[PDB]
Write an enzyme that holds these catalytic residues in place. Structure first.
Site, short mmCIF file in Angstrom:
data_model
loop_
_atom_site.label_atom_id
_atom_site.label_comp_id
_atom_site.label_asym_id
_atom_site.label_seq_id
_atom_site.Cartn_x
_atom_site.Cartn_y
_atom_site.Cartn_z
N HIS A 166 0.82 -1.23 0.00
CA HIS A 166 0.00 0.00 0.00
C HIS A 166 0.84 1.26 0.00
O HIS A 166 0.25 2.35 0.09
CB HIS A 166 -0.98 0.04 1.18
CG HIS A 166 -0.33 0.22 2.52
ND1 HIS A 166 -0.11 -0.83 3.40
CD2 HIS A 166 0.13 1.33 3.15
CE1 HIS A 166 0.47 -0.37 4.49
NE2 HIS A 166 0.63 0.94 4.37
N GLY B 273 3.03 5.51 10.09
CA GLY B 273 4.34 5.34 9.49
C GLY B 273 5.13 4.18 10.06
O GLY B 273 6.30 3.99 9.68
N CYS C 87 4.19 1.21 9.50
CA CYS C 87 4.00 0.13 8.55
C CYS C 87 5.31 -0.17 7.85
O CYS C 87 6.11 0.73 7.59
CB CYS C 87 2.88 0.47 7.55
SG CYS C 87 2.97 2.11 6.84
C1 LIG Z 1 1.23 2.56 7.15
C2 LIG Z 1 1.16 2.52 8.64
O1 LIG Z 1 2.03 3.06 9.29
N1 LIG Z 1 0.17 1.88 9.26
C3 LIG Z 1 0.26 1.58 10.67
C4 LIG Z 1 -0.82 2.42 11.33
C5 LIG Z 1 -0.88 2.09 12.80
N2 LIG Z 1 -1.25 3.09 13.74
O2 LIG Z 1 -0.61 0.96 13.17
N3 LIG Z 1 -0.92 1.49 8.59
C6 LIG Z 1 -1.82 2.35 8.08
O3 LIG Z 1 -1.69 3.57 8.18
C7 LIG Z 1 -2.96 1.71 7.32
C8 LIG Z 1 -2.83 2.08 5.84
C9 LIG Z 1 -3.66 1.19 4.91
C10 LIG Z 1 -3.45 -0.30 5.15
C11 LIG Z 1 -3.38 1.54 3.45
N4 LIG Z 1 -4.32 2.00 7.80
C12 LIG Z 1 -4.80 1.55 8.98
O4 LIG Z 1 -4.15 0.87 9.77
O5 LIG Z 1 -6.15 1.96 9.38
C13 LIG Z 1 -6.39 2.53 10.69
C14 LIG Z 1 -5.31 3.44 11.30
C15 LIG Z 1 -4.34 4.12 10.54
C16 LIG Z 1 -3.39 4.94 11.16
C17 LIG Z 1 -3.37 5.12 12.54
C18 LIG Z 1 -4.33 4.46 13.30
C19 LIG Z 1 -5.28 3.64 12.69
#
Ligand SMILES: *CC(=O)N(CCC(N)=O)NC(=O)[C@H](CC(C)C)NC(=O)OCc1ccccc1
Ligand SMILES: *CC(=O)N(CCC(N)=O)NC(=O)[C@H](CC(C)C)NC(=O)OCc1ccccc1
EC number: 3.4.19.12
Lengths: 306, 306
Positions: free
Chosen positions: A41, A143, A145
């Site tokens: 992603h 971030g 991820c």
């Molecule tokens: C990319 C990243 O760092 N993620 C980790 C987020 C957390 N807090 O663990 N993942 C996402 O941002 C992700 C992106 C999608 C899969 C394209 N979205 C997600 O996890 O949904 C809920 C969310 C996002 C950010 C912070 C809290 C919750």
């Protein structure tokens, strides 16, 4: 003596962490040999992340759309490929700091170490477990991820986890390093629920064994129980059933302490029905289930890695 | 979101750990520049360890009595020296992996990461605190002596602890990297007691703020309290007093959550008087005091280090 959530030392993984950028999206990637693995992603835009078609977003991409960078030295992408939810970015230089490694998929109840990273830089390391519902209860901000989880086996890093997303309850979901999610979760921002979680019984018994090896005994009793009569109480308390395989893995801990596995089940049984009465066990007021029998042996015999 | 005992990534310290052997005594040392730092009781024999005369023992030693090995290569010792309870072994080679570092003495309540080591090889990494009685509740087997604790500031490692001994209660004592013990303990195997420990009140409040930042709000109330009337209750519950400097450090966390420090004190007051009724906070059934305000901020804004 003493007992703590101990993580593996993280140096070998730190040398693999890099930053992958695509558009305005920046996440962490893992550089082993001449491949950088990251979550797919990264190619999404903040308006693509509702119902993306990844094959469709990827074919519209060139090698030069991927700013991969290790510290300050960047990395020229010379190939790319999608493997389930993971992107594999071929770069023109092999990572000098590449450890002996492998990729593995773990089961619920196993533990591993997480190196939380932001923009390719490590922030911290902690232990946790694959919950029975295939979430992990981590600590992850925006971030993170691309952060990976791992175990060390002498010199060999076994990568088992890459972080993709937080769920609404605040737990975390991710994949192994071949890109297949743990659990029924997908890499989009939609309604997904964790599913009911249970307590990892075999781990709780192992940590009761760690308690005994460290001097805690107030919870023992004369009492014993059958395997079947224990599983009766455990299901009532949302604990996963105990199998003979579990009894067998706890052998070494049973023999080191002289306390039969089913006797320790009688202790666990009596702790579920009575609680603790203000006593602690290994500094905890809760029955801990994020220590495997392996973890306990390691942290009670001094097993190192190099 | 999420909150765990997070340790600093340990790679910079792993690159510094070595094996020091004198006689049949082997422990861990810290090789920085052309110096290897270890506990001086390496020069003891298992019959010397009751009332040793360290300087008397050290003047009877030559450089070649010290087998120092970094991986498989050994280091030739070309000078030796005692600095309090720490031995300074000058080696014929500067550690290439020497990071930017400094030596610091920490106060009770502050935290740091321990890299438990055996025979120079890292075994595990974990976070903990300097208790108010200058013990630490570590996880330390035979041969862990010489393991160091540290904090990381961007690129600089701050060494604050070297492990020397276990006390009968199963807690641990040690020194800074200049050899002075934390607490009234000595590097000899005699009758030494930890002293009464108090709970680190400022850290409990910081962890209550971590709980609010992560959605745990159940323990809040409309009550408020004076600093004096709070302290009257905390001293009854064996908690360390709360000063205005504590109030001051909790400023940012107060402002980020919208909850005045004295309001959160009133909340802690009620938690002490009523317990939790089986409720939990950040996965814990106890009030956690091994998280400083800095630790909470770091883990709740993703500060990194490189
Ligand atoms: C990319 C990243 O760092 N993620 C980790 C987020 C957390 N807090 O663990 N993942 C996402 O941002 C992700 C992106 C999608 C899969 C394209 N979205 C997600 O996890 O949904 C809920 C969310 C996002 C950010 C912070 C809290 C919750
Ligand atoms: C250096 C080392 O191995 N020690 C750490 C031992 C533990 N478990 O912390 N320290 C000692 O062995 C130490 C040597 C003295 C200071 C010359 N002795 C000590 O800690 O006394 C009690 C003890 C010893 C070993 C194991 C448990 C308890």
């Amino acid at each position: 003596s003493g007992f703590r959530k101990m993580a593996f030392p993280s140096g070998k993984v730190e040398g693999c962490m890099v930053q992958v950028t695509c558009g305005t999206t920046t996440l962490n990637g893992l550089w082993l040999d001449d491949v950088v693995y990251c979550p797919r992603h990264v190619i999404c835009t903040s308006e693509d992340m509702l119902n993306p078609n990844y094959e469709d977003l990827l074919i519209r991409k060139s090698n030069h759309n991927f700013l991969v960078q290790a510290g300050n030295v960047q990395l020229r992408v010379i190939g790319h490929s999608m493997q389930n939810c993971v992107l594999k970015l071929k770069v023109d230089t092999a990572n000098p700091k590449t450890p002996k490694y492998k990729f593995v998929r773990i089961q619920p109840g196993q533990t591993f170490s997480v190196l939380a990273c932001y923009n390719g830089s490590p922030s911290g390391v902690y232990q946790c477990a694959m919950r029975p519902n295939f979430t992990i209860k981590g600590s992850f901000l925006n971030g993170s991820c691309g952060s990976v989880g791992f175990n060390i086996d002498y010199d060999c890093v076994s990568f088992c986890y890459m972080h993709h997303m937080e769920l609404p309850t605040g737990v975390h979901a991710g994949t192994d390093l071949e890109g297949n999610f743990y659990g029924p979760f997908v890499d989009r921002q939609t309604a997904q629920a964790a599913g009911t979680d249970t307590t990892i019984t075999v781990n709780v018994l192992a940590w009761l064994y760690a308690a005994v090896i460290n001097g805690d005994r107030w919870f023992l009793n004369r009492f014993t129980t059958t395997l079947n009569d224990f599983n009766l109480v455990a299901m009532k308390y949302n604990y996963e059933p105990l199998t003979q395989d579990h009894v067998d893995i706890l052998g070494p801990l049973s023999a080191q302490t002289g306390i039969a596995v089913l006797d320790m089940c009688a202790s666990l049984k009596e702790l579920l029905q009575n609680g603790m009465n203000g006593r602690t066990i290994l500094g905890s007021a809760l029955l801990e289930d994020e220590f495997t029998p392996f973890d306990v042996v390691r942290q009670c015999s001094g097993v190192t890695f190099q």
